[PDB]
Amino acid sequence: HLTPEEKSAVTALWGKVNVDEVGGEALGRLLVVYPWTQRFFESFGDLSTPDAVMGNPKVKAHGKKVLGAFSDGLAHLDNLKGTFATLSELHCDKLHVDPENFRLLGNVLVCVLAHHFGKEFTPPVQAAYQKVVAGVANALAHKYH
Amino acid sequence: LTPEEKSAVTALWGKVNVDEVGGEALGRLLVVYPWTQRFFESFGDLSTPDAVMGNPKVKAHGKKVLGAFSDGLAHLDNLKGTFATLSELHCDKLHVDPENFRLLGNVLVCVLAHHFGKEFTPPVQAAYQKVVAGVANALAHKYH
Amino acid sequence: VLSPADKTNVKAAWGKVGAHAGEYGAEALERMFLSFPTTKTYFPHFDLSHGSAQVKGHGKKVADALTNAVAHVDDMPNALSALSDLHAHKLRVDPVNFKLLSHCLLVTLAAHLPAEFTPAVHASLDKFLASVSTVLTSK
Amino acid sequence: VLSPADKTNVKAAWGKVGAHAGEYGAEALERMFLSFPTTKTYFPHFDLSHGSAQVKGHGKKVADALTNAVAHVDDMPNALSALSDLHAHKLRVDPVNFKLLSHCLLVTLAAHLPAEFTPAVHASLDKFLASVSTVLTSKY
Numbered sequence: 001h002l003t004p005e006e007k008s009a010v011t012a013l014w015g016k017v018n019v020d021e022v023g024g025e026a027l028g029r030l031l032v033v034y035p036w037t038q039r040f041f042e043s044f045g046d047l048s049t050p051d052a053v054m055g056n057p058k059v060k061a062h063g064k065k066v067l068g069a070f071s072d073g074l075a076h077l078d079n080l081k082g083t084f085a086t087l088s089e090l091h092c093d094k095l096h097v098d099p100e101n102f103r104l105l106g107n108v109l110v111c112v113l114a115h116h117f118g119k120e121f122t123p124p125v126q127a128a129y130q131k132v133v134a135g136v137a138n139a140l141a142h143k144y145h
Numbered sequence: 146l147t148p149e150e151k152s153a154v155t156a157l158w159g160k161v162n163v164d165e166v167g168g169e170a171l172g173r174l175l176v177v178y179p180w181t182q183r184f185f186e187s188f189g190d191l192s193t194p195d196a197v198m199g200n201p202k203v204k205a206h207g208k209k210v211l212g213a214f215s216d217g218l219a220h221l222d223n224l225k226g227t228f229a230t231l232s233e234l235h236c237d238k239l240h241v242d243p244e245n246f247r248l249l250g251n252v253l254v255c256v257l258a259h260h261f262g263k264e265f266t267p268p269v270q271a272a273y274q275k276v277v278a279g280v281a282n283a284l285a286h287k288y289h
Numbered sequence: 290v291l292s293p294a295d296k297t298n299v300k301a302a303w304g305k306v307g308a309h310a311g312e313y314g315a316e317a318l319e320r321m322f323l324s325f326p327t328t329k330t331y332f333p334h335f336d337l338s339h340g341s342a343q344v345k346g347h348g349k350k351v352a353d354a355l356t357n358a359v360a361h362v363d364d365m366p367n368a369l370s371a372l373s374d375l376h377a378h379k380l381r382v383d384p385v386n387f388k389l390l391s392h393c394l395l396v397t398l399a400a401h402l403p404a405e406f407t408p409a410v411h412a413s414l415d416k417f418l419a420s421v422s423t424v425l426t427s428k
Numbered sequence: 429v430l431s432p433a434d435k436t437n438v439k440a441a442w443g444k445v446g447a448h449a450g451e452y453g454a455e456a457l458e459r460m461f462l463s464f465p466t467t468k469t470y471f472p473h474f475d476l477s478h479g480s481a482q483v484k485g486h487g488k489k490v491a492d493a494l495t496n497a498v499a500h501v502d503d504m505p506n507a508l509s510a511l512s513d514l515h516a517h518k519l520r521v522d523p524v525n526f527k528l529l530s531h532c533l534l535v536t537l538a539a540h541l542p543a544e545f546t547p548a549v550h551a552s553l554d555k556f557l558a559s560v561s562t563v564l565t566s567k568y
């Protein structure tokens with residue numbers, strides 16, 4: 001459902017992402033911006049301030065891990081494949097995360113990318129990423145359907 | 146749906162006045178969520194609740210659409226076939242925000258509770274919430 | 290939002306609910322727990338089966354806060370102040386969950402108010418619960 | 429209902445945006461129209477192509493409203509009451525669309541404010557645009 005030019009805009013930016021750092025930034029901002037999400041990470045320790053959250057080692061450690069090898073191909077096009085069944089089960093059946101948070105975190109990642117790439121994160125490049133965040137979000141909510 | 150849920154859904158749906166509930170549900174959407182009026186300009190007077198509810202085009206549209214999901218004889222234990230067309234219509238042509246699919250479902254549920262009272266038990270509502278979520282997701286597929 | 294006509298409708302509905310408010314509060318919750326199971330994780334210490342005394346008791350507290358809101362409709366922010374800090378800071382209630390309970394409260398009302406739940410009253414009640422939800426998420 | 433820390437953070441972002449407010453408001457709109465194409469049906473009489481003078485002109489108006497909200501943050505209901513009736517009664521903008529443009533306004537800010545768009549300032553900006561959105565939806 002991505003056109004070649006959307007896949008292009010997505011892959012050429014992702015190419016330049018420090019995947020080791022953007023996951024931590026994204027998760028951290030989620031915890032800081034939507035503080036109800038801290039609920040699901042009370043085992044991470046100190047989330048008491050912005051500085052505590054963004055400097056928390058488990059935050060950064062969890063961010064890097066998840067956002068990790070999600071790369072050459074990523075999201076969908078990984079030579080077929082790439083489904084979220086087991087993650088939907090985890091996030092819906094086990095954790096009971098409202099799927100709205102899947103949309104929020106996608107929006108935060110988009111904010112992170114815009115921050116890191118500035119002028120390069122153009123309106124068309126953003127539109128392409130919005131479809132990916134919508135696609136991922138919907139996939140993770142498959143059990144709520 | 147579990148057999149328990151389909152049971153709850155079909156047993157109640159058997160007793161629905163299809164004619165009335167369609168018009169009722171659409172009218173209340175227009176009244177409760179007045180931004181939705183934007184898509185029904187051709188219907189004329191939507192100025193007050195009384196005008197909305199009494200409006201012939203509202204009640205006729207409600208009846209046409211819901212009249213195609215039965216009250217007995219199959220429909221409301223379907224899967225995923227007719228929704229493809231309606232998804233293209235609602236998303237690609239009308240550009241209805243999908244949130245409005247959940248709201249309308251929620252309105253249909255309010256209509257049902259109102260007409261059935263104590264018979265619309267918390268378990269029965271639960272089963273109807275899965276339906277309206279299932280229908281909402283189907284219609285939103287051309288956004289996904 | 291809250292127009293005189295909405296205040297009039299909300300009072301009319303409150304009069305007919307009368308002393309059943311607590312009981313309707315309980316019913317709303319059970320409606321929410323069954324319809325929206327993600328909401329249950331906020332009440333691990335509750336027995337949420339039908340007839341639970343904790344759901345009954347929690348129902349009265351909910352209804353008590355809603356009638357407090359009705360009684361101070363013109364200054365809900367001041368009225369519901371502590372409650373907003375409780376749900377945000379301590380309880381970390383995801384704001385989406387206010388819509389879900391609001392919807393169950395509407396459904397409950399619809400199920401008990403044959404005459405009163407007209408289309409205009411439905412709109413007024415939705416606006417009322419949306420204001421309460423705005424206050425409770427303000428923090 | 430914002431804290432003093434959030435007010436401080438919103439004023440810092442505003443200061444740094446400076447006279448670019450109008451330009452950034454244009455860009456936010458373009459970002460919304462491409463990301464969220466349903467929003468385009470509220471502007472049938474606009475050319476929504478890049479460099480459109482209608483989007484530039486409208487982006488200025490949106491910026492001016494946001495700048496007014498910044499300047500009267502403690503009484504936004506009064507500041508934006510007119511706009512609130514217009515969006516609700518005249519235009520009947522679907523409330524979900526405010527969230528869509530708030531997101532695009534945040535991304536625009538993020539793309540132009542590398543030092544300013546810290547997590548804390550992001551949170552404060554999010555709350556600011558949620559307050560604006562709450563007020564512009566208040567007439568439903």
Ligand code: HEM
Pocket residue numbers: 037040041066087090091095097101102103105106136137140
């Ligand atoms: C929207 C996209 C998201 C993706 C792609 C995603 C992906 C993942 C992945 C890969 C894991 C690790 C699974 C494993 O270790 O086996 C995970 C774990 C987790 N996610 Fe997410 N996630 C997302 C959103 C969220 C949100 C919004 C929340 C909470 C607000 C959340 C909370 C968690 C938690 C608590 C865990 C750890 C579970 C555990 O170890 O027991 N996730 N996620």
Ligand code: HEM
Pocket residue numbers: 181184185210213231235239241245246247249250280281284
């Ligand atoms: C949520 C479940 C919904 C279902 C099952 C549904 C179903 C339908 C059906 C069967 C039609 C008739 C199509 C035809 O004539 O071939 C229709 C038309 C229409 N629906 Fe819906 N609808 C839903 C929600 C909505 C919502 C939420 C809106 C607006 C906010 C909407 C706006 C319309 C409009 C404007 C038409 C007229 C299309 C035309 O004749 O030009 N629908 N819908």
Ligand code: HEM
Pocket residue numbers: 328331332350351354355372375376380382386387390391421422425
């Ligand atoms: C109209 C909306 C709501 C109202 C009026 C309301 C009212 C209240 C009241 C009065 C209390 C008890 C305060 C006390 O005794 O100190 C409370 C506690 C609580 N509320 Fe809410 N609430 C609302 C929405 C929500 C929602 C959506 C959730 C979602 C799960 C929720 C979860 C809780 C929890 C977990 C408690 C603590 C109960 C305990 O541990 O015993 N509330 N609420």
Ligand code: HEM
Pocket residue numbers: 467470471489490493494511515519521525526529530560561564
């Ligand atoms: C922060 C949120 C918003 C602000 C501050 C804002 C501000 C404004 C202002 C100042 C105007 C008047 C322009 C004039 O006088 O000519 C206006 C008009 C309008 N707004 Fe918004 N707006 C917001 C959100 C939205 C959203 C989400 C939509 C639709 C998706 C929307 C659609 C419109 C439309 C259609 C007009 C009339 C435009 C015309 O025909 O020239 N607004 N808005």
Ligand SMILES: C[C@H](Cc1ccccc1)NO
Pocket residue numbers: 022023024026027062063066067105109
């Ligand atoms: C929230 C995390 C995974 C994640 C997903 C996207 C961006 C950052 C982190 N799930 O555990």
Ligand SMILES: C[C@H](Cc1ccccc1)NO
Pocket residue numbers: 166167168170171206207210211249253
């Ligand atoms: C809004 C209508 C269809 C409808 C669906 C369910 C209940 C009432 C009406 N679409 O045109």
Ligand SMILES: C[C@H](Cc1ccccc1)NO
Pocket residue numbers: 299302303304306307310311313314317352355356359394395397398
């Ligand atoms: C309408 C008011 C508030 C209310 C009380 C219980 C359930 C729903 C709403 N009646 O007491």
